[PDB]
Write a protein that holds these residues in place. Structure first.
Motif, PDB file in Angstrom:
ATOM      1  N   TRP A 150       0.834  -1.195   0.000  1.00  0.00           N
ATOM      2  CA  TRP A 150       0.000   0.000   0.000  1.00  0.00           C
ATOM      3  C   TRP A 150       0.872   1.249   0.000  1.00  0.00           C
ATOM      4  CZ3 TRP A 150      -4.346  -0.996   4.211  1.00  0.00           C
ATOM      5  CH2 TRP A 150      -5.037  -2.161   3.864  1.00  0.00           C
ATOM      6  N   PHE A 151       0.337   2.334  -0.558  1.00  0.00           N
ATOM      7  CA  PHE A 151       0.980   3.641  -0.543  1.00  0.00           C
ATOM      8  C   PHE A 151       0.014   4.685  -0.001  1.00  0.00           C
ATOM      9  CE2 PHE A 151       4.311   2.844  -4.098  1.00  0.00           C
ATOM     10  CZ  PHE A 151       5.150   2.282  -3.159  1.00  0.00           C
ATOM     11  N   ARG A 152       0.563   5.690   0.676  1.00  0.00           N
ATOM     12  CA  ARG A 152      -0.196   6.838   1.154  1.00  0.00           C
ATOM     13  C   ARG A 152       0.544   8.109   0.764  1.00  0.00           C
ATOM     14  NH1 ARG A 152       2.226   9.230   5.680  1.00  0.00           N
ATOM     15  NH2 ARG A 152       3.700   7.858   6.769  1.00  0.00           N
ATOM     16  N   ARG A 153      -0.184   9.220   0.693  1.00  0.00           N
ATOM     17  CA  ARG A 153       0.428  10.506   0.401  1.00  0.00           C
ATOM     18  C   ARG A 153       0.290  11.440   1.602  1.00  0.00           C
ATOM     19  NH1 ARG A 153      -3.341  14.410  -1.280  1.00  0.00           N
ATOM     20  NH2 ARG A 153      -1.714  15.490  -2.474  1.00  0.00           N
ATOM     21  N   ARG A 180       3.176  10.231  -3.291  1.00  0.00           N
ATOM     22  CA  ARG A 180       4.105   9.116  -3.474  1.00  0.00           C
ATOM     23  C   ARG A 180       5.022   8.942  -2.265  1.00  0.00           C
ATOM     24  NH1 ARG A 180       0.984   8.468  -7.678  1.00  0.00           N
ATOM     25  NH2 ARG A 180      -0.299   8.290  -5.790  1.00  0.00           N
ATOM     26  N   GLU A 181       4.417   8.609  -1.129  1.00  0.00           N
ATOM     27  CA  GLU A 181       5.166   8.281   0.076  1.00  0.00           C
ATOM     28  C   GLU A 181       5.091   6.780   0.324  1.00  0.00           C
ATOM     29  OE1 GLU A 181       6.690  10.907   1.436  1.00  0.00           O
ATOM     30  OE2 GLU A 181       5.644  12.347   0.151  1.00  0.00           O
ATOM     31  N   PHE A 182       6.255   6.152   0.466  1.00  0.00           N
ATOM     32  CA  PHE A 182       6.321   4.707   0.632  1.00  0.00           C
ATOM     33  C   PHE A 182       5.748   4.289   1.981  1.00  0.00           C
ATOM     34  CE2 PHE A 182       8.535   0.986   2.278  1.00  0.00           C
ATOM     35  CZ  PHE A 182       8.353   0.067   1.267  1.00  0.00           C
ATOM     36  N   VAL A 183       5.091   3.130   2.003  1.00  0.00           N
ATOM     37  CA  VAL A 183       4.567   2.570   3.244  1.00  0.00           C
ATOM     38  C   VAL A 183       5.157   1.186   3.474  1.00  0.00           C
ATOM     39  CG1 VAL A 183       2.508   1.999   4.561  1.00  0.00           C
ATOM     40  CG2 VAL A 183       2.446   3.862   2.897  1.00  0.00           C
ATOM     41  N   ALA A 184       4.865   0.252   2.572  1.00  0.00           N
ATOM     42  CA  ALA A 184       5.328  -1.119   2.727  1.00  0.00           C
ATOM     43  C   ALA A 184       5.262  -1.826   1.383  1.00  0.00           C
ATOM     44  CB  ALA A 184       4.505  -1.878   3.772  1.00  0.00           C
ATOM     45  N   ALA A 185       5.937  -2.970   1.312  1.00  0.00           N
ATOM     46  CA  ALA A 185       5.926  -3.830   0.136  1.00  0.00           C
ATOM     47  C   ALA A 185       5.903  -5.281   0.589  1.00  0.00           C
ATOM     48  CB  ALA A 185       7.141  -3.567  -0.759  1.00  0.00           C
ATOM     49  N   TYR A 209       9.130  -3.061   5.384  1.00  0.00           N
ATOM     50  CA  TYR A 209       8.509  -2.223   6.398  1.00  0.00           C
ATOM     51  C   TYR A 209       9.016  -0.792   6.280  1.00  0.00           C
ATOM     52  CZ  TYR A 209      12.915  -2.739   8.967  1.00  0.00           C
ATOM     53  OH  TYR A 209      14.239  -2.730   9.337  1.00  0.00           O
ATOM     54  N   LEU A 210       8.187   0.139   6.743  1.00  0.00           N
ATOM     55  CA  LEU A 210       8.539   1.550   6.740  1.00  0.00           C
ATOM     56  C   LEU A 210       9.533   1.861   7.857  1.00  0.00           C
ATOM     57  CD1 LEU A 210       8.075   4.139   5.264  1.00  0.00           C
ATOM     58  CD2 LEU A 210       6.021   4.561   6.624  1.00  0.00           C
ATOM     59  N   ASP A 211      10.246   2.978   7.696  1.00  0.00           N
ATOM     60  CA  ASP A 211      11.155   3.427   8.745  1.00  0.00           C
ATOM     61  C   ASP A 211      10.391   3.839   9.997  1.00  0.00           C
ATOM     62  OD1 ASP A 211      13.591   3.999   9.923  1.00  0.00           O
ATOM     63  OD2 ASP A 211      13.673   6.043   9.125  1.00  0.00           O
ATOM     64  N   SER A 212       9.151   4.309   9.831  1.00  0.00           N
ATOM     65  CA  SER A 212       8.348   4.702  10.984  1.00  0.00           C
ATOM     66  C   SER A 212       8.017   3.505  11.867  1.00  0.00           C
ATOM     67  CB  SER A 212       7.067   5.395  10.521  1.00  0.00           C
ATOM     68  OG  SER A 212       6.256   5.753  11.624  1.00  0.00           O
ATOM     69  N   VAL A 213       7.600   2.392  11.263  1.00  0.00           N
ATOM     70  CA  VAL A 213       7.296   1.196  12.037  1.00  0.00           C
ATOM     71  C   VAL A 213       8.596   0.509  12.434  1.00  0.00           C
ATOM     72  CG1 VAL A 213       5.039   0.957  10.976  1.00  0.00           C
ATOM     73  CG2 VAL A 213       6.999  -0.183   9.946  1.00  0.00           C
ATOM     74  N   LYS A 214       8.691   0.117  13.701  1.00  0.00           N
ATOM     75  CA  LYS A 214       9.940  -0.373  14.275  1.00  0.00           C
ATOM     76  C   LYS A 214      10.065  -1.872  14.022  1.00  0.00           C
ATOM     77  CE  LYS A 214      10.654   3.744  15.737  1.00  0.00           C
ATOM     78  NZ  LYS A 214       9.287   4.301  15.542  1.00  0.00           N
ATOM     79  N   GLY A 215      10.916  -2.238  13.068  1.00  0.00           N
ATOM     80  CA  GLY A 215      11.235  -3.630  12.809  1.00  0.00           C
ATOM     81  C   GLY A 215      10.218  -4.360  11.958  1.00  0.00           C
ATOM     82  N   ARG A 216       9.094  -4.741  12.563  1.00  0.00           N
ATOM     83  CA  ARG A 216       8.056  -5.486  11.867  1.00  0.00           C
ATOM     84  C   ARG A 216       6.814  -5.529  12.744  1.00  0.00           C
ATOM     85  NH1 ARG A 216       5.281 -10.017  10.501  1.00  0.00           N
ATOM     86  NH2 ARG A 216       5.645 -10.690  12.659  1.00  0.00           N
ATOM     87  N   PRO A 274      16.619   8.288  -7.776  1.00  0.00           N
ATOM     88  CA  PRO A 274      17.007   7.541  -6.574  1.00  0.00           C
ATOM     89  C   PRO A 274      16.100   7.822  -5.386  1.00  0.00           C
ATOM     90  CG  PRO A 274      18.584   9.332  -7.074  1.00  0.00           C
ATOM     91  CD  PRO A 274      17.339   9.567  -7.887  1.00  0.00           C
ATOM     92  N   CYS A 275      15.428   6.781  -4.885  1.00  0.00           N
ATOM     93  CA  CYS A 275      14.643   6.929  -3.664  1.00  0.00           C
ATOM     94  C   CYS A 275      15.549   7.052  -2.446  1.00  0.00           C
ATOM     95  CB  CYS A 275      13.694   5.742  -3.507  1.00  0.00           C
ATOM     96  SG  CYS A 275      12.863   5.233  -5.027  1.00  0.00           S
ATOM     97  N   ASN A 276      16.610   6.243  -2.403  1.00  0.00           N
ATOM     98  CA  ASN A 276      17.693   6.311  -1.426  1.00  0.00           C
ATOM     99  C   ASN A 276      17.276   5.823  -0.043  1.00  0.00           C
ATOM    100  OD1 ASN A 276      18.295   9.184  -3.236  1.00  0.00           O
ATOM    101  ND2 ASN A 276      19.864   7.582  -3.130  1.00  0.00           N
ATOM    102  N   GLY A 277      15.986   5.575   0.168  1.00  0.00           N
ATOM    103  CA  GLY A 277      15.575   4.952   1.410  1.00  0.00           C
ATOM    104  C   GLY A 277      14.395   4.007   1.316  1.00  0.00           C
ATOM    105  N   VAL A 278      13.806   3.868   0.129  1.00  0.00           N
ATOM    106  CA  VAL A 278      12.562   3.127  -0.039  1.00  0.00           C
ATOM    107  C   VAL A 278      12.537   2.466  -1.410  1.00  0.00           C
ATOM    108  CG1 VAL A 278      11.181   4.531   1.567  1.00  0.00           C
ATOM    109  CG2 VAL A 278      11.357   5.189  -0.844  1.00  0.00           C
ATOM    110  N   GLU A 279      11.509   1.643  -1.628  1.00  0.00           N
ATOM    111  CA  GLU A 279      11.275   0.991  -2.917  1.00  0.00           C
ATOM    112  C   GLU A 279      10.074   1.669  -3.569  1.00  0.00           C
ATOM    113  OE1 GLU A 279       8.668  -1.237  -3.985  1.00  0.00           O
ATOM    114  OE2 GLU A 279       9.649  -1.512  -5.927  1.00  0.00           O
ATOM    115  N   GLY A 280      10.372   2.624  -4.447  1.00  0.00           N
ATOM    116  CA  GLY A 280       9.338   3.403  -5.099  1.00  0.00           C
ATOM    117  C   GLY A 280       9.556   3.573  -6.588  1.00  0.00           C
ATOM    118  N   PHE A 281       9.575   4.820  -7.052  1.00  0.00           N
ATOM    119  CA  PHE A 281       9.783   5.108  -8.466  1.00  0.00           C
ATOM    120  C   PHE A 281      11.247   4.884  -8.821  1.00  0.00           C
ATOM    121  CE2 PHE A 281      10.375   8.448 -11.894  1.00  0.00           C
ATOM    122  CZ  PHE A 281       9.891   7.632 -12.894  1.00  0.00           C
TER     123      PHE A 281
END
Ligand SMILES: *[C@@H]1O[C@H](CO)[C@@H](O)[C@H](O)[C@H]1NC(C)=O
Lengths: 117, 124, 194
Positions: free
Chosen positions: A34-37, A43-48, A58-65, C147-154
């Motif tokens: 999922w992605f959120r803005r 285009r802010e990354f959340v998870a994959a 996992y996102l940098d905000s969420v700690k570990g898993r 380069p995202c440089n911290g994430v898997e995005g564009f």
């Protein structure tokens, strides 16, 4: 981009681990996350999450898993949204790997939650 | 660089028709031989093959006992002897050829250079 | 005095992926391949650099056995002196390769109703892999354009891609179990013979 329905909506209470869920079509070997803005941004990354059922980013905000669910038979992808960050209210869409190669597209909907305490 | 095929016709049960095939190219040294049979666009099924060195001969189970292959160097005309005509023998015959030489057995359609025309036999 | 564990490699319950292949060494045994060479149970028995019959009267000091499962039409990349995506980023066979490549169809086990997505392969890296070298990393490679440089995005992708099997797939898409047994010689006495 045919039919990828989602769900959401809630402003009951914040501070806990309220969950959010959606569904995706027949994906097979497709990666989903999922992605959120943000206001005045996008285009802010959340998870994959991989299609194996064991690969998780996992996102940098969420700690570990945190807790994430995925049912291959039902074809549903879940997200970790623990700690209910007070400023982390936005629109959530279950976008697939449109940026990547072997995933066609998904940008067609979005869900929101506005829990507060 | 192409393929030349000779032989074929119509023969009833209890007959014979040799199914020869020759390679005009000079890469016969490192090219193996293989055979396939399918008339109505069916998936090609292995028939027979010869190893690169020539000591070992491998055949499909169904064609064992009647079909026989041989290697030629005068004209590079690999020969196959077809006998014991049956109804299912009415099919297009393909003269497959293997790629660069490799010690072993190939029994799959993964790689082949050229596809021949071949001939089919009709039994009344 | 005991037969080599070639049957153990052949009849492994599970097989490793192309990026996580398992190397099982063979030593302190003698292998009798006569019963299996003519068994015709293998659809591919290429032996680069050595004749299958000649290796019987020879002793090899070290044996390397590798196992992975790939597509029916993807076995072209597994060849000495061959350039390809699998060779460059997943598994590279060196030019001085003297092993025997054995492969066979796995529609009975690997392919089943409902689909299989356990297997993986890698396609993103900086340069090509050194032959006989395997690297496992979770680093998310990023394209130089954005380069995202911290994430898997564009223009940022995870190297691993999910890989699928199902019975409805064609012959080209069918799974194939691939086992490679390499042999080498050294000055030390050989514990493996034929
Ligand atoms: C592999 O091992 C299993 C478990 O013992 C056995 O049932 C099977 O027959 C073995 N494979 C072959 C080809 O015999």
């Amino acid at each position: 981009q045919v039919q990828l329905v989602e769900s959401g909506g809630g402003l009951v209470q914040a501070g806990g681990s309220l969950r959010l869920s959606c569904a995706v079509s027949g994906l097979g070997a497709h990666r989903v996350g999922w992605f959120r803005r943000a206001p005045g941004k996008e285009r802010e990354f959340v998870a994959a999450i991989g299609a194996n059922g064991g690969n998780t980013n996992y996102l940098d905000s969420v700690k570990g898993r945190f807790t994430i669910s995925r049912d291959n038979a039902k074809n549903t992808i879940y997200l970790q949204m623990n700690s209910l960050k007070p400023q982390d209210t936005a629109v959530y869409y279950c976008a697939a790997r449109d940026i990547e190669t072997a995933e066609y597209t998904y940008w067609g909907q979005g869900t929101q939650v506005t829990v507060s305490s | 660089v192409q393929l030349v095929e000779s032989g074929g016709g119509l023969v009833q049960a209890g007959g014979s028709l040799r199914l020869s095939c020759a390679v005009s190219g000079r890469t016969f040294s490192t090219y193996g031989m293989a055979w396939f049979r399918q008339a109505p666009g069916k998936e090609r099924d292995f028939v027979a093959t010869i190893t690169r060195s020539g000591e070992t001969t491998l055949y499909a189970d169904s064609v064992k006992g009647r079909f026989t292959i041989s290697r030629d160097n005068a004209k590079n005309t690999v020969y196959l002897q077809m006998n014991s005509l049956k109804i299912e023998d009415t099919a297009v015959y393909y003269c497959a050829v293997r790629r660069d030489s490799s010690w072993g057995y190939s029994r799959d359609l993964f790689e082949y250079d050229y596809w021949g025309q071949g001939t089919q036999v009709t039994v009344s | 005095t005991n037969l080599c564990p070639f049957g153990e490699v052949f009849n492994a319950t599970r097989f490793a992926s192309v990026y996580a292949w398992n190397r099982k060494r063979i030593s302190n045994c003698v292998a009798d391949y006569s019963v299996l060479y003519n068994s015709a149970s293998f659809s591919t028995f290429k032996c680069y650099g050595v004749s299958p019959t000649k290796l019987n009267d020879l002793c090899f000091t070290n044996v390397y056995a590798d196992s992975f499962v790939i597509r029916g039409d993807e076995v072209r990349q597994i060849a000495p002196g061959q350039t390809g995506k699998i060779a460059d980023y997943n598994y590279k066979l060196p030019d001085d390769f003297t092993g025997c490549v054995i492969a066979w169809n796995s529609n009975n086990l690997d392919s089943k109703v409902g689909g299989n997505y356990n297997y993986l392969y890698r396609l993103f890296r900086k340069s090509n892999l050194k032959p006989f070298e395997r690297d496992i990393s979770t680093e998310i490679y990023q394209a130089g354009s954005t380069p995202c440089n911290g994430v898997e995005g564009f223009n940022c992708y995870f190297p691993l891609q999910s890989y699928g099997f199902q019975p409805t797939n064609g012959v080209g898409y069918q799974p194939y179990r691939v086992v490679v047994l390499s042999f080498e010689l050294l000055h030390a006495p050989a514990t493996v013979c034929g």
